[PDB]
Write an enzyme that holds these catalytic residues in place. Structure first.
Site, mmCIF file in Angstrom:
data_model
loop_
_atom_site.group_PDB
_atom_site.id
_atom_site.type_symbol
_atom_site.label_atom_id
_atom_site.label_comp_id
_atom_site.label_asym_id
_atom_site.label_seq_id
_atom_site.Cartn_x
_atom_site.Cartn_y
_atom_site.Cartn_z
ATOM 1 N N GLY B 29 80.945 98.020 37.011
ATOM 2 C CA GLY B 29 80.061 97.137 37.777
ATOM 3 C C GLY B 29 80.525 96.860 39.197
ATOM 4 O O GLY B 29 81.602 97.294 39.607
ATOM 5 N N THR B 30 79.708 96.119 39.943
ATOM 6 C CA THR B 30 80.009 95.789 41.339
ATOM 7 C C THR B 30 81.115 94.741 41.420
ATOM 8 O O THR B 30 81.410 94.061 40.436
ATOM 9 C CB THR B 30 78.771 95.260 42.100
ATOM 10 N N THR B 31 81.717 94.612 42.598
ATOM 11 C CA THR B 31 82.842 93.699 42.793
ATOM 12 C C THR B 31 82.356 92.256 42.922
ATOM 13 O O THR B 31 81.354 91.985 43.583
ATOM 14 C CB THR B 31 83.670 94.074 44.044
ATOM 15 N N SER B 74 80.638 90.556 36.760
ATOM 16 C CA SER B 74 80.533 91.993 37.001
ATOM 17 C C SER B 74 80.363 92.713 35.672
ATOM 18 O O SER B 74 80.988 92.340 34.679
ATOM 19 C CB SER B 74 81.789 92.507 37.704
#
Ligand SMILES: [Cl-]
Ligand SMILES: [Cl-]
Ligand SMILES: [Mg+2]
Ligand SMILES: [Mg+2]
Ligand SMILES: [Mg+2]
Ligand SMILES: [Mg+2]
Lengths: 225, 243, 241, 195, 231, 250, 111, 204, 244
Positions: B29-31, B74
């Site tokens: 996932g994204t930060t 995330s």
């Protein structure tokens, strides 16, 4: 008439032995002193079937609890279990009890009302003869009573109920629970109401009653051969 | 073998491979980050712009719980939403019974126990999110991070997602260079920088910055989103540092 | 080979999931120790904060179950907190129903029975934790009772749990062989904590700072944990003799 | 007759000791001041059974609260009482006064009448005998009284309530809640009747 | 492979294959386009037939006077989800006398789809939805995926060959967003957008399906000779 | 959640074997030796207190357990399974009997209830069998003294004397030579100690051996006086000292 | 004791013509001898060219009307925007009312 | 209206020397109307006897219930139930219907087969045990029976004398009650023989 | 989820057989042999205890023959624990019938009820079947003396003479050879013991390895008596018939 009295090294409870249905005496020697555990006894007033059943139930659960915990049962445990049960049934279980006993914590004396209220005291009384008994307790109770003084006070309080209250009568039962000792149950501690000899015998002549048929009743099981 | 096919099964190691596989979804996932400051906390997240057709500032990722707690995560976004919905129920029942708003450590365990429960049975899947959350309560500021296993600790700074190593390194510098502490307005600026620095791991697509904060002085101990001039000020500060 | 996935018997009469839960116990790589004094029960545990970003005050494996009972856990924190919350609930319920504080050994038995159920029922997994309960019981005095994933439990004179439990165990065994008594003959709990820390140092062979340890103390009518500064005072006294 | 009064150093709870069944005094040495937490106590009025069952449950909730979240506030304790009294209002007859001491909030008093409503007050009075001292208490109460002044205020107030109310009597029990700790007081008839 | 038997099982790389297989059902479905301006929001859907004797499967469903969606994938699953939206829109009106926000409608769909991906026994929804609506904050367009992911967009397309229409909208972004107070031109842009996803077949009178909602325009569906104007 | 294991985990194999029961019996075989001997005026049950650690207080762990005042139990196999069975056994003695008839159940019927519980774990959904074999000694007015064995299957058999667990095969042979129908209780205790010494490796004393009897009524252990019909429990656990006294005359 | 019913007064009147129909009602709302409102609408446009009024206890009347309007909405959803005929509406309203046969809507309804 | 006095009836039990006696009337009615003069109210389960007064449907129902329970007791225990144990079974069974009770007044009578000790007991409708040494009474003429038994009874009577005493107690009490009478039956019980006698009484 | 571990106890094989029922019957074929023989004036039940020990308390032991009521008894073959579950159910069913109709339950009705319970475990619930086969010996005033058998499938049939458990093939051949319709109880007793004596896997048939019972009208006048034989009584009948 039931009472509870604390003393130096323990506690004593007592009760009368009359059981009534309205104005009729059903049992002249009823046992109102119940055992919850070996060193925890209770005296019950009100609905007889209720005081017995609620006493046996909590006594059963206390035994199982004592086995689970590997400890001797405490009076506060019986107290708590009783009041929570009675409270749940909103007074419909008409059990009014005086609970007393000794345990590792010490000696204890409580009363329980049918709606689930508990009270603590050095001296207590319940039942229709509670007022006659409490009058005696309030007149003669003192701090630092001996075992012998407390039994006397307790049985005197029950006698007040026996003589002055119509719902109470016959004999006096007692149970003494002293610290570091076995509890002693004194069934028929006093017997001040023995029936006098009858003036006549009403034993009938054999054959006085008229009979129509006779027959043997088979109580045994089905037989061989 | 076969120990990894079912949730709540111990392997011969004493490991729950299904939970470890959920961590892989989180790492994909994204930060997202969290920074504990003097009198509060700051949350920030990387939002990947997949297409020009995405409406700017509309697809909000950071979620509020009650009025004093912020949550960001995330991994699998729906799993995070489910967890926040539960958190909101937990916070509501706490306030219903006890009157006071739920303390952050108390709230942290409510999520922790719920996530941990999803590692106890094969009839459920573990959560595919690591959640960074916190806020201000009677005892002050608190920041937490919660993993798929149900494991959580308190943090001075926290980071998760694809750019977590880059972020963690940046957070460690702030802790060393500011032992006396960091202000709320500073933390917002630093948060922006760290997300921009952590974006090197997702450098293919351009991104949108989203920040929120709870602070005793700046927001009266309530969760608020960073908007307008204060957001642009943080973006400018972040852009200046990368160049 | 599905007899290794759920809690059913293998041909050898073994429960592999229970055995693997025991292995999860050491995943944290932390060692704990518990000893009894005259008036107190002391429990110490290693504290390891590897990450600088962690708030070290929140990192703990010792729990205050009730006013009188304390619990240290050896195993992953999620399962540890699961057990802690349940023990707190059980202890509170016990006091409400039966009118007195739940004893340490009774709580240990209750938690052990819950653990047993997970070894017999298939849908529930065992918790990968060993729970060490401590108190100063009003009947039995200083008490140490420990529970494991098999549902086994027993009382202890002293005990140790973790990767290097055997080294600590033998160290304690050798001390009680000399003194020939079931406890640490010491008046103050401060000196009992000093004994506990000293013998862990000797057994493990490592020195400790104030932040390397975590201490819990049980006295009559209360259990409490020591702060870093309280531990520092303890470490100073050890060094000065 | 029950009352709770805040003052400079904290709060004091006060009560009589009479329990009745009609006109018969079933208990003349009752303890109506009951503990739900170390420094959070309550005064009980109405049904003895209802108030006991409630106080027992609240004590259980706050013990469990303490294990998880640490020492609860007096406001939190009052909320748990309220929740029980309000949701079971059809089946309860309980008038409760909650009083506690924090270091942050100091002495606080919350009264919870029949309906289940909550009212935070400087001082509170309740029970059948409270009716006779509304006038006296309103005229004689001051904020930030000393411990000795507050004890005298409760003693004089409950003295009058006992004098006029048949359902009130016996001894005057009091519980003092401060940072210093918890002090129990008692005052016998010969002392308070001659006031 | 070994980790696609049910929805309760992660793969070693952290993937949920049953959800991914449900996502595949959408790609097999017929193309549908969504786009909006500041005043209006439009749905355009290519309907699919079984054969020449059969009717063309309906793609667009009305949820409220101010909201509705188009579907792509398992039609029965769209009926379930649209029914849920109808109820939620309705609950908002009856209880709060409040038209349901399009953003909040997306949040409710996300959470409903999510429960099916984490529990044993059930299955993910096998359909993708494009929700349009006009609420108190103007026109809106949402894209729903049965993984749970919901996204607010200016324009988009889902189904087979949907990449062509999505690229067109990405070029036309600056133009069609400005089409305010002109419904016919906004539909024209939608019809031209869906045309980029066509191969072999073309837009006929019983093939095309259009829907619109706006400022003073209730959610209405156009089929048959009502869309001949736009062919 | 929900317990979705509503199906049997114990099933018949092609050969007609119930695998989980067989495997449970294998777990019992690994367990520490325990035995029971019946005399004319009593019954004795005994086992080794296999301490897991010398730091552990073996007094706190009770392998021999009171079920009713006149009934006791000992086991071989998995200790935790035994502990919960004792809890259930104690409770069922009250719920299914004492609360109905106002008296404690006779040995055979309590055994029957325990057996039922163990059978259900062999057929019910989502559970494994109990990994223990019980020896239940007891007395009642109409049946006298009795000794029963209960297996993981739920099957139970009455014994004059028997042994279960580690060295049961050798121990049963030893008992066959020594047992007769004219044994007094003290003679049975003596034989029990002799039989148990063979299976024990290390220390053999009152602190490492657990032994209890079902014998005469113990009014001193009743806890109260005043009711003639209540004469006290027949179950008594022998002390560490009492065992050592009989080890000198061994 | 709690009385769940009330009387909000008012009067309504429906007359059918050859190619039209009227439904009239006063706008007064009352309790006992007091006036609540001088203008509180009582007759409503329910859609599909149907007008409705439920006179008596206003809370019950509002609830019923609210439910019937909802019934019309779902009739469109479930039956391809078909127009609800007056005879079909009447039968639907019978079922709404009889559904509370043992705790009645305390109203006189006219459509 | 009062369920316990719709059908009418009485039962009485007495102890003697190594013997017990239990007796009942035979009437069953609907208030003033006499319906049956063959309605026996005494039953036996092995050597334990049970007399039941009160509402006739509950009398019948309870007999069938205790027959059910005693038959299972015997199969499991491999022995007949004793009076002391049966007494507790009745109490248990009645109290489980505490808030919806059977409107009955049971009376247990029998001799312990092991100890040989005579045993009688009575109950209220919800379970309370009245374990008396001398006698137990139940029914619509319980007041009358109490007066007759308390005056006529003396301890340690022989079977053939005890028969006369209990028969006269029942007969004269029944004759002062409108809802009792219409015949009577007396059981004389010894350790290994039981005699049943039907009494001749006035049929009004 | 949980499906992975489900054995599926209630399914058909490709051949149309119930796996678990067939395997349960295989289990029962290793159990001690039980024989039932019906005569004109009574019924015999004989059964062999499995490899006993000298230290087994026989006089208080019961593993084969059980009493359902005063008129009906059963001989067990299979898992004893399973059998006791069903026996207690059957005992209750008989008492329910008696309470309802005030008459002793007809034998077939009791047999059908137990057989229906067994059937249920083969069709629904996902549980293993009861590994038990019964021989029912009973009497009622409709059909008189009756012998039935039920097995884990829940199928039941009536018999003049029948065996269950081990060596039934050999046992049934011997019974079929020597059985006659005009036979009496004393002759049936002899047949039952002679059949066990030949089919037994033991070296010799002794009193301590047997359970025995008869249902006779040999009770004083028109009524039926159940006789569960004591160890000494089994020893005497073994000498009388000339086996020991
Ligand atoms: Cl438990
Ligand atoms: Cl009180
Ligand atoms: Mg399991
Ligand atoms: Mg007064
Ligand atoms: Mg008459
Ligand atoms: Mg007449």
């Amino acid at each position: 008439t039931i009472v509870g009295v604390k003393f130096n090294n323990g506690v004593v409870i007592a009760a009368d032995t009359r059981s009534t249905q309205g104005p009729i005496v059903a049992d002249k020697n009823c046992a109102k002193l119940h055992r919850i555990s070996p060193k925890i006894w209770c005296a019950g007033a009100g609905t007889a079937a209720d005081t017995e059943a609620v006493t046996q139930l909590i006594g059963s659960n206390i035994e199982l609890h004592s086995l689970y915990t590997s400890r001797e049962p405490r009076v506060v445990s019986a107290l708590q279990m009783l009041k929570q049960h009675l409270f749940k049934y909103q007074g419909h279980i008409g059990a009014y009890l005086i609970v007393a006993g000794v345990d590792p914590t010490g000696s204890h004396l409580f009363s329980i009302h049918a709606h689930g209220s508990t009270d603590v005291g050095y001296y207590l009384s319940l039942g229709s003869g509670s007022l006659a008994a409490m009058a005696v307790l309030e007149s003669h109770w003192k701090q630092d009573l001996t075992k012998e003084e407390a039994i006397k006070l307790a049985s005197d309080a029950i006698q007040a109920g026996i003589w002055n209250d119509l719902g109470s009568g016959s004999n006096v039962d007692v149970c003494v629970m002293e610290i570091g000792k076995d509890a002693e149950y004194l069934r028929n501690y006093l017997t001040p109401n023995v029936r006098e000899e009858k003036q006549k015998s009403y034993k009938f002549p054999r054959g006085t009653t008229a009979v129509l048929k006779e027959s043997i009743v088979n109580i045994c099981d089905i037989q061989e051969e | 073998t076969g120990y990894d096919l079912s949730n709540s099964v111990f392997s011969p190691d004493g490991r729950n491979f299904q939970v470890e596989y959920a961590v892989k979804a989180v790492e994909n996932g994204t930060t997202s980050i969290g920074i504990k400051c003097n009198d509060g906390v700051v949350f920030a997240v990387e939002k990947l712009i997949t297409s020009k057709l995405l409406v700017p500032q509309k697809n909000v990722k950071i979620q509020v719980v009650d009025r004093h707690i912020g949550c960001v995560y995330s991994g699998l976004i729906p799993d995070g939403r489910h967890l926040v919905n539960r958190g909101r129920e937990e916070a509501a029942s706490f306030k219903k019974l006890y009157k006071t708003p739920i303390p952050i450590p108390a709230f942290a365990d409510r999520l922790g126990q719920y996530v941990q429960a999803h590692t106890l049975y094969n009839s459920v899947r573990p959560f595919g999110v690591s959640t960074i959350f916190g806020g201000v309560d009677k005892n002050g500021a608190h920041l937490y991070m919660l993993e798929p296993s149900g494991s959580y600790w308190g943090y001075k700074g926290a980071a998760t997602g694809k750019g977590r190593q880059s972020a963690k390194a940046e957070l460690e510098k702030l802790v060393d260079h500011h032992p006396e502490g960091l202000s709320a307005r500073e933390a917002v600026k630093q948060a922006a920088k760290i997300i921009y620095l952590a974006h090197e791991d997702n450098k293919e697509k351009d991104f949108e910055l989203e920040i929120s904060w709870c602070s005793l002085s700046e927001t009266n101990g309530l969760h608020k989103f960073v908007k307008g001039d204060l957001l642009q000020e943080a973006i400018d500060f972040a852009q200046k540092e990368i160049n | 080979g599905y007899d290794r996935h759920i809690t059913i018997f293998s041909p050898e009469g073994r429960l592999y999931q229970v055995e693997y839960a025991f292995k999860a116990t050491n995943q944290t790589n932390i060692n704990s120790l518990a000893v009894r004094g005259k008036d107190c029960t002391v429990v110490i545990s290693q504290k390891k904060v590897p990450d600088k970003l962690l708030d070290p005050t929140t990192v703990s494996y010792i729990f205050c179950i009730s006013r009188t009972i304390g619990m240290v856990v050896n195993g992953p924190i999620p399962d540890a907190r699961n057990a802690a919350l349940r023990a707190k609930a059980e202890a509170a319920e016990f006091r409400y129903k039966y009118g007195y504080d739940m004893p340490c050994d009774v709580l240990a038995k209750r938690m052990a029975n819950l653990s047993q159920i997970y070894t017999q029922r298939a849908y529930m997994r065992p918790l990968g934790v060993i729970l060490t309960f401590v108190s100063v019981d009003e009947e039995l005095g200083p008490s140490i009772y420990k529970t494991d994933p098999a549902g086994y439990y027993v009382g202890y004179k002293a005990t140790a749990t973790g990767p290097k439990q055997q080294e600590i165990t033998t160290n304690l065994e050798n001390h009680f062989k000399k003194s020939k008594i079931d406890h640490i003959n010491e008046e103050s709990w401060e000196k009992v904590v000093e004994f506990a820390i000293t013998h862990m140092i000797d057994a493990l062979g490592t020195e400790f700072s104030k932040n390397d340890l975590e201490v819990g103390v049980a006295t009559k009518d209360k259990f409490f944990t020591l702060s870093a500064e309280n531990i520092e005072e303890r470490l100073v006294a050890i060094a000065e003799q | 007759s029950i009352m709770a009064v805040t003052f400079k150093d904290g709060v004091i709870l006060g009560a009589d000791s009479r329990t009745t069944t009609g006109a018969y005094i079933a208990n003349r040495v009752t303890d109506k001041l009951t503990r739900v937490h170390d420094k959070i106590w309550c005064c009980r009025s109405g049904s003895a059974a209802d108030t006991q069952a409630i106080a027992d449950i609240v004590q259980y909730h706050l013990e469990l609260y303490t294990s998880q979240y640490g020492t609860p506030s007096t406001e939190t304790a009052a909320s748990v009482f309220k929740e029980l009294c309000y949701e079971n209002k059809d089946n309860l007859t309980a008038g409760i006064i909650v009083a506690g001491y924090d270091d942050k909030n100091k002495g606080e008093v919350y009264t919870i009448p029949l309906g289940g409503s909550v009212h935070k007050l400087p001082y509170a009075i309740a029970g059948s005998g409270s009716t006779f001292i509304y006038g006296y208490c309103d005229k004689n109460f001051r904020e930030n009284m000393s411990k000795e002044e507050t004890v005298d205020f409760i003693k004089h107030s409950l003295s009058q309530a006992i004098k006029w109310d048949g359902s009130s009597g016996g001894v005057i029990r009091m519980v003092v809640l401060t940072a210093a700790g918890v002090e129990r007081l008692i005052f016998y008839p010969d002392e308070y009747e001659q006031l | 492979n070994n980790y696609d038997g049910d929805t309760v099982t992660f793969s070693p790389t952290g993937r949920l294959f049953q959800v991914e297989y449900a996502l595949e059902a959408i790609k097999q479905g017929s193309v549908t386009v969504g786009l909006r301006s500041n005043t209006h929001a439009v749905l355009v859907a290519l309907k699919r037939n079984a054969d020449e004797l059969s009717s063309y499967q309906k793609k667009i469903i009305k949820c409220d006077e101010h909201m509705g969606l188009s579907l792509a994938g398992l039609a029965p699953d769209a009926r379930v989800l649209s029914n849920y939206l109808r109820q939620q829109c309705n609950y908002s009106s009856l209880v709060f006398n409040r038209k349901l926000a399009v953003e909040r409608a997306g949040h409710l769909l996300c959470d409903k789809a999510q429960k099916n991906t984490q529990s044993y026994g059930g299955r993910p929804y096998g359909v993708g939805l494009l929700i349009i609506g006009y609420d108190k904050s103007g026109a809106h367009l949402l894209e729903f995926q049965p993984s749970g992911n919901v996204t607010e967009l200016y324009g988009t397309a889902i189904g087979a060959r949907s990449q062509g229409a999505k690229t067109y909208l990405e070029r036309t972004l600056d133009t069609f967003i400005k089409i305010d107070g002109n419904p016919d031109e906004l539909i024209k842009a939608g019809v031209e957008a869906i045309s980029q996803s066509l191969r072999d077949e073309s837009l006929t009178v019983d093939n095309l399906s259009i829907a619109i909602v706006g400022k003073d325009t209730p959610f209405t569906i156009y089929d048959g000779e009502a869309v001949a104007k736009y062919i | 959640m929900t317990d979705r294991y509503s199906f049997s985990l114990t099933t018949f194999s092609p050969s007609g074997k119930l695998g989980q029961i067989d495997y449970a019996l294998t777990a019992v075989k690994q367990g520490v030796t325990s035995l029971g001997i019946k005399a004319t005026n009593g019954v004795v049950i005994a086992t080794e207190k296999k301490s897991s650690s010398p730091l552990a207080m073996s007094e706190t762990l009770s392998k021999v357990s009171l079920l009713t005042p006149d009934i006791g139990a000992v086991y071989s196999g998995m200790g935790p399974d035994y502990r919960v069975l004792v809890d259930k056994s104690r409770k069922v003695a009250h719920t299914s009997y004492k609360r109905i008839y106002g008296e404690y159940p006779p040995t055979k019927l309590l055994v029957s209830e325990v057996a039922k519980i163990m059978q259900e774990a062999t057929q019910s959904g989502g559970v494994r069998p109990f990994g223990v074999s019980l020896l239940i000694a007891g007395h009642d007015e109409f049946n006298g003294f009795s000794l029963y064995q209960v297996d993981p299957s739920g099957s139970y058999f009455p014994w004059k004397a028997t042994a279960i667990g580690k060295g049961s095969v050798a121990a049963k042979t030893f008992l066959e030579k020594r047992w007769n129908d004219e044994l007094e209780l003290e003679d049975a205790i003596h034989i029990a100690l002799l039989t148990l010494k063979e299976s024990v490796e290390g220390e053999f004393n009152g602190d490492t051996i657990e032994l209890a009897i079902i014998g005469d009524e113990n009014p001193d252990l009743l806890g109260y006086t005043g009711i003639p019909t209540d004469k006290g429990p027949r179950f008594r656990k022998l002390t560490s000292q009492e065992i050592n006294d009989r080890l000198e005359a061994l | 004791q709690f009385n769940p019913y009330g009387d909000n007064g008012g009067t309504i009147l429906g007359i059918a013509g050859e190619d039209f129909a009227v439904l009239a009602g006063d706008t007064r709302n009352i309790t006992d001898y007091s006036i609540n409102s001088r203008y509180e609408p009582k007759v409503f446009d329910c859609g599909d060219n149907i007008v409705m009024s439920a006179n008596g206890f206003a809370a019950d009347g509002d609830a019923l009307v609210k439910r019937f309007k909802n019934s019309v909405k779902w009739y469109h959803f479930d039956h391809n925007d078909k127009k609800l005929s007056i005879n079909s509406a009447a039968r639907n309203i019978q079922h709404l009312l009889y559904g509370k046969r043992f705790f009645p809507y305390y109203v006189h309804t006219i459509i | 209206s009062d369920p316990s006095s719709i059908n009418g009836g009485i039962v009485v039990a007495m102890t003697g020397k190594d013997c017990v006696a239990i007796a009942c009337d035979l009437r069953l009615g609907s208030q003033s109307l006499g319906v049956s003069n063959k309605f026996e109210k005494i039953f036996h389960y092995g050597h334990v006897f049970l007399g039941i007064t009160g509402l006739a449907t509950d009398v019948t129902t309870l007999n069938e219930m205790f027959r059910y329970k005693t038959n299972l007791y015997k199969l499991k225990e491999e022995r007949a139930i004793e009076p002391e144990t049966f007494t507790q079974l009745v109490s248990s069974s009645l109290y489980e219907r505490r808030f919806g009770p059977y409107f009955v007044g049971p009376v247990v009578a029998g001799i312990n087969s092991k100890s040989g000790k005579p045993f009688i007991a009575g109950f209220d409708l919800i379970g309370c045990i009245d374990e008396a040494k001398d006698f137990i009474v139940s029914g619509t003429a319980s007041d009358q029976l109490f007066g007759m038994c308390e005056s006529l009874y003396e301890p340690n009577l022989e079977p053939e004398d005890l028969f006369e005493t209990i028969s006269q107690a029942l007969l004269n009490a029944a004759d002062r009650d409108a809802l009792s009478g219409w015949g009577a039956v007396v059981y004389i019980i010894k350790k290994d023989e039981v005699v049943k006698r039907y009494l001749k009484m006035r049929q009004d | 989820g949980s499906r992975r571990y489900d054995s599926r106890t209630t399914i058909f094989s490709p051949e149309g057989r119930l796996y678990q029922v067939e395997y349960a019957l295989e289990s029962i074929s290793h159990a001690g042999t039980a024989i039932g023989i019906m005569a004109s004036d009574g019924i015999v039940l004989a059964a062999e205890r499995k490899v006993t020990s000298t230290l087994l308390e026989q006089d208080t032991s019961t593993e084969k023959l059980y009493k359902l009521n005063d008129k009906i008894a059963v001989a067990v073959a299979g898992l004893t624990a399973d059998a006791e579950i069903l026996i207690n159910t059957a005992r209750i069913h008989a008492q329910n019938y008696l309470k309802t109709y005030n008459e002793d339950i007809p034998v077939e009705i009791l047999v059908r009820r137990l057989s229906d319970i067994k059937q249920g475990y083969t069709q629904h619930g996902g549980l293993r079947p009861f590994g038990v086969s019964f021989i029912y010996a009973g009497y009622d005033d409709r059909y008189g003396y009756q012998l039935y058998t039920s097995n884990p499938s829940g199928n039941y049939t009536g018999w003049k003479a029948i065996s269950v458990g081990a060596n039934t093939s050999a046992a049934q051949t011997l019974l079929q050879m020597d059985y006659k319709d005009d036979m009496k109880v004393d002759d049936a007793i002899e047949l039952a013991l002679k059949t066990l004596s030949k089919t037994t896997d033991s070296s010799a048939l002794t009193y301590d390895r047997l359970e025995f019972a008869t249902i006779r009208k040999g009770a004083n006048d028109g009524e039926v008596y159940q006789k569960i034989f004591k160890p000494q009584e089994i020893k005497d009948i073994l000498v009388k018939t000339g086996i020991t």
